[PDB]
């Protein structure tokens, strides 16, 4: 019984996780929407 | 370390495993949007 996760996942979350620690946002879930929106929008 | 971080990171990953989205970044926007609006 073996599965895996796509490449990018852990690094994707690492980037999110890093900025959480730096900025210490009051609401983690909304910070996520914002953080990831920028990623989506950056192209 | 903020409370609720580990739980958050795990929940996302688990949904990525269940649903196998093609775009992880965009699925993240949606997954976390659904989380914030779920209350």
């Amino acid at each position: 019984s073996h599965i895996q996760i796509p490449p990018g996942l852990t690094e994707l979350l690492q980037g999110y996780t890093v900025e959480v620690l730096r900025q210490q946002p009051p609401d983690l879930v909304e910070f996520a929407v914002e953080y990831f929106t920028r990623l989506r929008e950056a192209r | 370390i903020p409370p609720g971080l580990t739980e958050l990171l795990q929940g996302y990953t688990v949904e990525v495993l269940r649903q196998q989205p093609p775009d992880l970044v965009e699925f993240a926007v949606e997954y976390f949007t659904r989380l914030r609006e779920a209350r």
Partner: peptide
């Protein structure tokens, strides 16, 4: 900031590790 990047790496690694464990023990 270097210790911050290393810390985040572990938390993710831990969250993913448990996300895999959860999904395997959820399917079967």
């Amino acid at each position: 900031d270097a210790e911050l990047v290393r810390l985040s790496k572990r938390l993710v690694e831990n969250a993913v590790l448990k996300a895999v464990q959860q999904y395997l023990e959820e399917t079967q």
